[PDB]
Design a protein around this ligand. Structure first.
Ligand SMILES: CCCCCCCCCCCCCCCCCC(=O)OC[C@H](COP(=O)([O-])OCC(O)COP(=O)([O-])OC[C@@H](COC(=O)CCCCCCCCCCCCCCCCC)OC(=O)CCCCCCCCCCCCCCCCC)OC(=O)CCCCCCCCCCCCCCCCC
Ligand SMILES: CCCCCCCCCCCCCCCCCC(=O)OC[C@H](COP(=O)([O-])OCC(O)COP(=O)([O-])OC[C@@H](COC(=O)CCCCCCCCCCCCCCCCC)OC(=O)CCCCCCCCCCCCCCCCC)OC(=O)CCCCCCCCCCCCCCCCC
Ligand SMILES: CCCCCCCCCCCCCCCCCC(=O)OC[C@H](COP(=O)([O-])OCC(O)COP(=O)([O-])OC[C@@H](COC(=O)CCCCCCCCCCCCCCCCC)OC(=O)CCCCCCCCCCCCCCCCC)OC(=O)CCCCCCCCCCCCCCCCC
Ligand SMILES: CCCCCCCCCCCCCCCCC[C@@H](O)O[C@H](CO[C@H](O)CCCCCCCCCCCCCCC)COP(=O)(O)OCC[N+](C)(C)C
Ligand SMILES: CCCCCCCC/C=C\CCCCCCCC(=O)OC[C@H](COP(=O)(O)OCCN)OC(=O)CCCCCCC/C=C\CCCCCCCC
Ligand SMILES: CCCCCCCC/C=C\CCCCCCCC(=O)OC[C@H](COP(=O)(O)OCCN)OC(=O)CCCCCCC/C=C\CCCCCCCC
Ligand SMILES: CCCCCCCC/C=C\CCCCCCCC(=O)O[C@H](COC(=O)CCCCCCC/C=C/CCCCCCCC)COP(=O)(O)OCCN
Lengths: 603, 156, 459, 178, 128
């Protein structure tokens, strides 16, 4: 009966079998990574069927199978929402995870704890599937925290390195700052709508007030690393390259945008929250592209690229185009995962060397990675008829013809230009010049795992945009007629970015050297935000926590008030009472005084 | 194994007990300096420089390579504040005040520009979108028993 | 109720007539059996109560506390088996006798149909704990810690006896059922204000309320492992249970009386969470975390709403289990290092991986990771406080963030990094310690499957 | 790292350190090899002009404006080797380093595996046990009165002697044990 | 001439920019020599107790004991009530409580006034 629900639950259920077998014998052998990769591929090919059914008909279902608890009039049950977003995102996430795991079978070959690493990846995937398909706020919170904990564990994979632990704690801190707003939204919805279920929230909120939407926006900004809470994402590159390719590139970091998409019926009825979302997205994308333009670590550059793409996604949310933001999420998954794959291949081939100043001519020395990275860069820059076209071009067109801020539109255009610019920077400094790596050449691509994993996402980043765009039903009014210069604006700014970046990069060959300016120093240190906001607030909280909260109040004044005062007073009274010389003279003099007082004061 | 006289004591007031305290903490008398004798109970404990542990020499052969400390050396009062996992005081290429001005200036400018863009929006030379059935009255909220004031759209 | 009480009493002659080398085995087996008997009490009704007799009753507020109390004794025996190896048989039997007497007093306290009996047993629990702290304690500050623990409690609870005898002289009864059915409003009067204070302060001082929490770090740091376990798990919840039982007669006076205590708890959770960030001792850090959790429980009880009460019950149970596990882990480290300092032994995950897994799970549970019952209580109390006032969300979020911060700080400082070079006496973890951690942690994840068992009478 | 530090740095050592830092940061600024070679030769030419200067005061006044110039143009993101104290893999493998004494706690079923390795380990233990008793007296007799003046240790001077305090330098786990 | 670097509390002065290192005197050299002498004595003691095959325990560190004792137990006996301590204690221990009391009291008085006036619109507010 109606195989939609059975298949959708079966995929999530079979994703958990290797976790149960992690205590079996296969976990102690070297076949465990292949086992998990096979399980993920089977889950993907199984989940491909409900998407096909939705494409044919549009099937939509809610599954409330298990009832966990009921508090008075509020009923909490394990409910799964299997709408367009879920049945479209699950195949993409499973495909990317399968590719990344096949890549990790090669990349992490010498790591002693690879079974554990693979197990962790599976755990993260399970948590993300819980987050995506959740129907009420409690389950989505469960996934929200599970992905964060898996991020913490995978970032600090090399727990002997201090910086990895610091980056993991930084990610936890920023995600908790977002969790504050998440909890605020949950409390508001439970107090006013009397439910955490999405259906009741949609019924009882025709004009959603500012508070729950502001809480949701804070949570989305925290988990998607917007300008206020951005620095944790670039610092999350301390983990292994497959972790940065899976979690912090294409699957985990789109969780805030997905949360804002899930609550879009309430988002469109509020105009101030939409404005705040638009401004946040614009400032985030501009600032992150400006940071990316001048970085030397390739992983840092690509992470800032991911942050800028998330900013563009939240701009799309701000202009009231949620389905377009979902499409951009799906496209960015493909091409950004492939970009991280190429970067990791380059890093491994050069003896774990990440800086681009020490990599030269790789266009011919290793051509498959070169062509994959070129295709990914073209896709990232919205080249026509490429995966990035069908999302980014529509984003630019929709922002250009909407009643929005002029500043936000200008920032978005500059961000697109800077995107083309740092893509040019990556290509130029990684593939074109003369070699700059140490003489002992160990360059090698001839491994079937790496080639197959990269080429699957290559085919995806070439054709998935066309396929998905032509297979989904329409969900928004099109921009049929446009001014000719306004139609070409994305291409014009992108080509300007290529030309300016290439021209400025070609001057590095000239035999002249000058000290850097103030703008370069501002862009290189990421606007000095990490320095100031990681040295001033942390110091001021820790110093207070030690001096006032711990010493001054607790160890001194609270101790002085009750116990020390009581002890001092009692000891003084004891000394006064017991200090008697033992002379009956004074004793009976006091008795005489006492006797007189009793006679004259009590009658 | 540590004796009574090897524990921290009260603020030193005479040069002789100052030298005794300096000897106790395994440092020179000329390098010894207690905290000011204020109300807070620092007592007799050296006021080490407020330099962080991140900026210690990473090439010295410390007994504790992770914390960059030597066995028997006096420990800074705020050691757990500077553990390379927390606030550090490493000198930066750009000065603190210049960094603050640049960071603050950029943020203030971005905010004021966003406000200006709010004051001066951008749009297209078109009229409002038109919806057929009384601005979609029945499908937006409902209330079918009120007979709202009809709105009819202008064809040009 | 006697089917639980009588076997606990028979634990004493069995212990004193046991062989010199069979006290631990017999005590553990019979304590586990007693715990199984206690499980039957959980079945509860939506109606009044399980009124066994005129002396004792059971309720869905008392049942989880009784189950936890009965379950804790085998764990305390397992923890105490190690450091009492070189002790004479008579003194080990005396230690087991103290633990059994404490369990018996707690069991009779939680049923307690009549309030003076509740007070008598609530004070009788004070003696065995004091003897355990001041007799089998390692440091020289155990005497001062015991003095603080005794005198704070007695100063708080002496006016409660006067309040109770006055209430019985006026109303005529102290049976909880009659008190509930014949409740009458309290007029806003100075005498009523002082009666409210005398009824409330005794339970406030044992929570501990912020500013009256000084005794707790001393008592927890200087106590042996079993004493720390019981103090953190059960003895702190006596104040919450008493407040839940006694706030029925304090209405409508509680609406404005609660403000001083609400402000103190709301600011003190932030204060103690921040204190946890700068701490050089594991036990002190765990104790201050307990103070923060109990302050939030105080807020829940003072708000006095059904969601507040359910969250407070769930958080009490979850905190008891989590604090017991954390103290046990700290004791396992201490028995190897003999220092009790965070920064000395580092990078223990490399040497002890399974114990590092236990550390991670305990820290995650203390961090209130969903869907653990810790977060269930936390979220219910947060929602109730938000309904009380929308401005509480700032303080609650700050507390959550700082809590995650110091929990992961404690995990990272001890488990990650580079091992200390000169420490070479770190032997592999024994099966006893691993079983102790497993028996601490598995009930939490089983209880998260049936949260209605710990949500109290207002579920 | 291996060499014991001195009480201070002389002028010549400080000049060498500045020269190395300036060359490294110039290489970081000048990515391409030919440009770096040109500017490094120009840097050497500018650097050795004051080689033959004699008086101490002008020499000390120099290297100071040089350090200030270096700090002004120090390339706030210099290139760092991956294993360096600032590199991307500085302490990546420190979690795989297990001490040697951990093998003393292995179960006999585990020690049944690798019997030759444990026999060699026992031989090393015997050698250390004798050598330590020799080394204590050797260091006691060789140390100057009043305590050491530097943290430099003497080598072995007899036939069967071993260098003092050798056990924890010879038995390092490895650079990449796993 | 180049723009000067200005140090701060959280961005200290670089070692190579210290005028103190350039002011060399025989007293400074003797001070450095005796500093390294005491450091070498401490290192010798630590390594002697570290490389001993007989030791099978933790090397007790008097510096760590002194640090913990001063941080925890040496505070109150050295405490002296001064205007600074009194004022800081009063502020940091009383001000936040009254501030939060005022905030919450005002918020709740406003909410109660709105409820009594009936203009709050508490529809669907069932769980509290
Ligand atoms: C409406 C008409 C539409 C058409 C518009 C016109 C068409 C285009 C016109 C061209 C306009 C400019 C384009 C060139 C960009 C500049 C490139 C350049 O020269 O850099 C070298 C030069 C110095 O380089 P260097 O020091 O020698 O570095 C050493 C090596 O080169 C180290 O090199 P490296 O190898 O390490 O790395 C190289 C990297 C390193 O280079 C850098 O350092 C980057 C810094 C400059 C690039 C940033 C430009 C983005 C602008 C966004 C700013 C938003 C406002 C921010 C407000 C700040 C508030 C304080 O450079 C690059 O990779 C390329 C940089 C970007 C070029 C490619 C894209 C540019 C096109 C997009 C821009 C505009 C078109 C928008 C499209 C839409 C149409 C409207 O940089 C500059 O001097 C900056 C120039 C402009 C900065 C203006 C901001 C100054 C603010 C001062 C204070 C003002 C008062 C504020 C008061 C506030 C009170 C509250
Ligand atoms: C997600 C579904 C899973 C289904 C599979 C069933 C798994 C059964 C687990 C039972 C509970 C675990 C017991 C705790 C101690 C672990 C014992 C141990 O030492 O393992 C040695 C054993 C042998 O390894 P070894 O090489 O000899 O030892 C070397 C070291 O130990 C090194 O070992 P390691 O490096 O591999 O680390 C040990 C491992 C194991 O240690 C742990 O940390 C596991 C415990 C994590 C929970 C922490 C508290 C947070 C609150 C959760 C409370 C919910 C519980 C639900 C009911 C539980 C029933 C008992 O830690 C982790 O892997 C990281 C955990 C972080 C996960 C964060 C996500 C939690 C929230 C997810 C939502 C759950 C409900 C879904 C609701 C919506 C969908 C229906 O390894 C294992 O078997 C690992 C255990 C399996 C991983 C569990 C992860 C998720 C399962 C949570 C409870 C079941 C959820 C029910 C939903 C089913 C659908
Ligand atoms: C529970 C949860 C959390 C709670 C947090 C816990 C916080 C609670 C503890 C708060 C404790 C703060 C107050 C401590 C008492 C101050 C006096 C003292 O400690 O004696 C030591 C000490 C007596 O020693 P002494 O040998 O006479 O003179 C030593 C001084 O160095 C010689 O000083 P001087 O001769 O220069 O003094 C001249 C001048 C000080 O001139 C000034 O600059 C300060 C004037 C402002 O003094 C005045 O004019 C008095 C006004 O008193 C002082 O030295 C300072 C006294 C002035 C401090 C003002 C008091 C602070 C205001 C707090 C009142 C707010 C609430 C009060 C509630 C009362 C109704 C229930
Ligand atoms: C130290 C660490 C923390 C320990 C625990 C602290 C918690 C205890 C605090 C007690 C709670 C408040 C006590 C009384 C509250 C009643 C409200 C009253 O105080 O406010 C005004 C009262 O006005 C004035 O406050 C009168 C009292 C003034 C004298 C009290 C001393 C003030 C500071 C003392 C604090 C000391 C606490 C520690 C003791 C050792 C209201 O004006 P009024 O309408 O007329 O009175 C209404 C009550 N009626 C109806 C019965 C008449
Ligand atoms: C496995 C191999 C054996 C195969 C044979 C069994 C085939 C299925 C037949 C099972 C019988 C049906 C059944 O399970 O009974 C229903 C029963 C529920 O009990 P009820 O009383 O009916 O309602 C719940 C409240 N009382 O369903 C089940 O328990 C089985 C499936 C439960 C759902 C899966 C739970 C997994 C997650 C665990 C809980 C996680 C924490 C809670 C999250 C909260 C989210 C809001
Ligand atoms: C509110 C937040 C209040 C501030 C919390 C203070 C917490 C102090 C305790 C933290 C422990 C110390 C610590 O973490 O160390 C700092 C640690 C290490 O420094 P690294 O840069 O990683 O350098 C490592 C390489 N050498 O860095 C950090 O993680 C500190 C992070 C502090 C963030 C504070 C800034 C947050 C401000 C948010 C403002 C934006 C609001 C959101 C806008 C949303 C709009 C809808
Ligand atoms: C951690 C230490 C905390 C110690 C406890 C602090 C609070 C103590 C509570 C006040 C003490 C007295 C309790 C009252 C006993 C209940 C009896 C009662 O309520 O009846 C009242 C009796 O009320 C009183 O008599 C109260 C007099 C108070 C005298 C004792 C003062 C003790 C200290 C008071 C100030 C501190 C209280 C709060 C302390 C804050 C925490 C330190 C009315 O008496 P009637 O005359 O019969 O009826 C009136 C109509 N004819």
């Amino acid at each position: 009966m109606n195989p939609f629900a059975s298949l959708t639950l079966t995929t999530l259920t079979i994703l958990t079998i290797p976790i149960m077998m992690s205590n079996s014998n296969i976990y102690k052998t070297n076949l465990y990574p292949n086992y998990v990769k096979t399980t993920v591929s089977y889950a993907f090919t199984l989940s491909l069927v409900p998407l096909l059914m939705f494409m044919h008909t549009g099937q939509e279902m809610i599954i409330s199978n298990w009832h966990w608890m009921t508090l008075q009039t509020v009923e909490l049950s394990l409910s799964f929402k299997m709408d367009y977003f879920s049945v479209m995102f699950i195949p993409v996430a499973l495909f990317v995870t399968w590719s990344i795991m096949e890549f990790s079978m090669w990349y992490m070959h010498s790591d002693p704890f690879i079974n554990r690493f693979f197990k962790y990846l599976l755990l993260f995937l399970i948590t993300m599937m819980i987050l995506v398909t959740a129907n009420n706020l409690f389950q989505l919170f469960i996934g929200w925290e599970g992905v964060g904990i898996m991020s913490f564990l995978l970032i600090g994979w090399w727990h002997g390195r201090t910086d990895a632990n610091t980056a993991a704690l930084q990610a936890i801190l920023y995600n908790r700052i977002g969790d504050i707003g998440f909890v605020l939204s949950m409390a508001w919805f439970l107090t006013h709508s009397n439910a955490w279920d999405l259906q009741q929230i949609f019924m009882l909120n025709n004009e959603c007030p500012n508070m729950p939407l502001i809480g949701l926006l804070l949570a989305a900004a925290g988990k998607s690393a917007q300008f206020g809470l951005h620095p944790w994402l670039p610092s999350a590159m301390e983990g292994p390259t497959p972790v940065s390719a899976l979690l912090h590139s294409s699957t985990m970091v789109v969780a805030g945008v997905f949360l804002l998409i899930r609550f879009y019926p309430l988002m469109e009825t509020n105009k101030l929250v939409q404005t705040m979302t638009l401004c946040l997205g614009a400032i985030t994308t501009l600032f992150t592209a400006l940071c990316a333009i001048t970085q030397n670590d390739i992983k840092k550059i690509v992470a800032f690229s991911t942050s800028s793409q998330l900013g563009l996604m939240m701009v799309t949310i701000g202009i009231n185009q949620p389905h377009l933001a979902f499409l951009h999420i799906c496209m960015h998954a493909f091409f950004k995962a492939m970009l991280f794959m190429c970067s990791g291949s380059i890093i491994h081939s050069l003896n774990d060397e990440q800086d681009i100043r020490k990599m030269g001519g790789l266009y011919k020395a290793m051509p498959f990675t070169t062509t994959a990275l070129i295709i990914g860069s073209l896709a990232l820059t919205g080249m026509p008829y490429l995966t990035g076209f069908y999302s980014k071009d529509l984003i630019i067109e929709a922002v250009n013809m909407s009643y929005t801020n002029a500043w936000a539109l200008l920032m978005t255009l500059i961000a697109t230009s800077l995107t083309a610019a740092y893509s040019t920077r990556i290509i130029f400094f990684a593939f074109l010049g003369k070699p700059r790596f140490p003489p002992l050449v160990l360059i090698n691509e001839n491994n079937p795992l790496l080639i197959n994993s990269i080429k699957r996402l290559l085919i995806g980043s070439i054709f998935a945009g066309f396929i998905i765009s032509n297979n989904i039903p329409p969900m928004t009014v099109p921009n049929t007629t446009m001014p000719l210069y306004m139609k070409m604006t994305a291409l014009i700014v992108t080509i300007m970015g290529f030309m300016l970046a290439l021209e400025l990069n070609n001057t590095t060959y000239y035999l002249k050297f000058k000290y850097p300016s103030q703008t370069y120093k501002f862009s290189n240190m990421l606007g000095y935000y990490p320095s100031i906001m990681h040295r001033l607030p942390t110091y001021h909280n820790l110093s207070m926590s030690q001096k006032s909260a711990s010493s001054l109040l607790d160890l001194i004044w609270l101790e002085t008030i009750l116990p020390k005062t009581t002890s001092f007073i009692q000891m003084k009274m004891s000394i006064m009472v017991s200090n008697q010389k033992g002379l009956i003279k004074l004793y009976f003099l006091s008795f005489l005084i006492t006797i007189m007082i009793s006679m004259t004061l009590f009658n | 194994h540590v004796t009574k006289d090897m524990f921290p004591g009260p603020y030193p007031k005479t040069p002789e007990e100052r030298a005794a305290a300096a000897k106790k903490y395994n440092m020179r008398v000329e390098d010894y300096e207690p905290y000011p004798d204020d109300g807070m109970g620092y007592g007799d404990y050296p006021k080490l420089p407020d330099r962080s542990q991140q900026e210690r020499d990473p090439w010295y052969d410390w007994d504790h390579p992770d914390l960059r400390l030597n066995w028997g050396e006096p420990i800074h009062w705020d050691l757990d504040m500077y553990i390379r996992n927390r606030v550090d005081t490493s000198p930066t290429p750009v000065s603190w005040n210049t960094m603050c001005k640049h960071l603050f200036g950029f943020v203030a400018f971005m905010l004021f520009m966003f406000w200006v863009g709010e004051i001066y929006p951008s749009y297209q030379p078109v009229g409002p979108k038109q919806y057929p059935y009384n601005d979609l009255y029945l499908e937006r909220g409902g209330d079918p028993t009120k007979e709202p004031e009809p709105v009819v759209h202008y064809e040009i | 109720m006697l089917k639980i009480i009588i076997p606990t009493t028979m634990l004493l002659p069995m212990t004193w007539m046991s062989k010199h080398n069979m006290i631990w085995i017999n005590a553990t087996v019979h304590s586990l059996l007693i715990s199984l008997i206690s499980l039957s009490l959980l079945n509860q009704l939506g109606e009044n109560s399980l009124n066994f007799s005129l002396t004792f009753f059971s309720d869905s507020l008392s049942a989880p506390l009784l189950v936890l109390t009965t379950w804790l004794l085998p764990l305390m025996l397992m923890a105490s088996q190690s450091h009492l190896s070189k002790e004479t048989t008579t003194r080990k039997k005396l230690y087991i006798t103290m633990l059994i007497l404490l369990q018996l007093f707690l069991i009779m306290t939680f049923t307690a149909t009549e309030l003076i009996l509740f007070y008598i047993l609530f004070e009788a629990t004070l003696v065995p704990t004091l003897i355990i702290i001041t007799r089998w304690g390692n440091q020289t500050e155990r005497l001062n810690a015991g003095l603080y623990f005794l005198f704070y409690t007695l100063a708080g609870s002496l006016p409660l006896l006067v309040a109770l005898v006055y209430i019985q002289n006026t109303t005529g009864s102290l049976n909880f059922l009659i008190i509930h059915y014949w409740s009458h409003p309290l007029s806003n009067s100075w005498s009523n204000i002082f009666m409210w204070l005398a009824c409330i302060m005794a339970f406030m001082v044992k929570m501990p309320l912020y500013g009256l929490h000084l005794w707790l770090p001393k008592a927890h740091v200087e106590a042996p492992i079993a004493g720390s376990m019981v103090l953190a798990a059960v003895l702190l919840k006596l104040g919450g249970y008493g407040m839940m039982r006694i706030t029925t007669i304090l209405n409508p006076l509680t609406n404005y009386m609660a403000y001083p205590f609400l402000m103190l708890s709301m600011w003190g959770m932030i204060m103690t969470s921040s204190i946890c960030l700068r701490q050089t001792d594991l036990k002190s850090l765990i104790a201050y975390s307990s103070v923060s959790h109990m302050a939030l429980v105080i807020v829940a009880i003072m708000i006095q709403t059904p969601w507040s009460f359910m969250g407070a019950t769930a958080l009490m149970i979850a905190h008891g289990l989590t604090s017991s596990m954390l103290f046990c882990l700290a004791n396992t480290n201490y028995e190897r290092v003999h220092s009790r300092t965070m920064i000395l032994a580092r990078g223990l995950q490399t040497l002890l991986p399974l114990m590092a897994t236990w550390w991670l799970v305990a820290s995650l549970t203390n961090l209130a990771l969903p869907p653990s019952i810790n977060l269930i209580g936390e979220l219910f109390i947060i929602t109730a406080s938000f309904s009380w006032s929308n401005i509480t969300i700032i303080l609650m979020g700050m507390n959550m963030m700082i809590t995650a911060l110091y929990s992961l700080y404690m995990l990272i400082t001890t488990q990650r990094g580079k091992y200390t070079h000169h420490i070479n006496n770190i032997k592999p973890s024994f099966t006893r310690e691993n079983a102790l951690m497993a028996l601490h942690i598995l009930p939490l994840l089983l209880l998260t499957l049936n949260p209605k068992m710990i949500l109290g009478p207002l579920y | 790292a291996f060499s014991a530090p001195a009480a201070y740095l002389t002028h010549q050592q400080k000049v060498l350190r500045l020269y190395k830092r300036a060359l490294r940061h110039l290489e970081s600024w000048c990515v391409h090899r030919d440009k770096y070679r040109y500017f490094a030769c120009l840097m050497r030419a500018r650097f050795d002009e004051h080689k033959n200067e004699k008086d101490m005061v002008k020499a000390t006044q120099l290297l100071r404006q040089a350090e200030e110039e270096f700090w002004y143009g120090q390339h706030p993101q210099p290139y760092i080797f991956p294993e360096s104290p600032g590199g991307t893999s500085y302490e990546r493998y420190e979690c795989y380093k297990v001490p040697e004494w951990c093998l003393d706690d292995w179960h006999p079923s585990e020690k049944a595996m690798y019997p030759d390795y444990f026999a060699k380990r026992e031989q090393w233990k015997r050698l250390r046990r004798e050598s330590w008793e020799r080394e204590v007296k050797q260091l006691q007799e060789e140390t100057p009165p009043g305590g050491p003046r530097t943290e430099a240790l003497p080598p072995a001077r007899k036939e069967g002697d071993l260098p003092p305090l050798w056990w924890h330098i010879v038995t390092r786990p490895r650079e990449r044990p796993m | 001439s180049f723009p000067k670097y200005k140090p701060s509390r959280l961005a200290t002065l670089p070692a190579t920019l210290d005028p103190a290192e350039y002011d060399i005197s025989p007293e400074t050299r003797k001070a450095q020599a005796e500093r390294l002498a005491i450091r070498s004595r401490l290192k010798r003691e630590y390594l002697l107790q570290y490389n001993d095959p007989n030791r099978l325990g933790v090397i007790e560190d008097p510096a760590l004991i002194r640090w913990t004792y001063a941080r925890s137990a040496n505070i109150y006996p050295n405490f002296r009530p001064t205007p600074k301590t009194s004022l800081l204690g009063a502020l940091f221990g009383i001000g936040p409580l009254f501030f939060w009391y005022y905030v919450f009291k005002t918020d709740r008085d406003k909410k109660e006034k709105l409820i009594q006036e009936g203009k709050l619109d508490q529809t669907f507010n069932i769980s509290y």
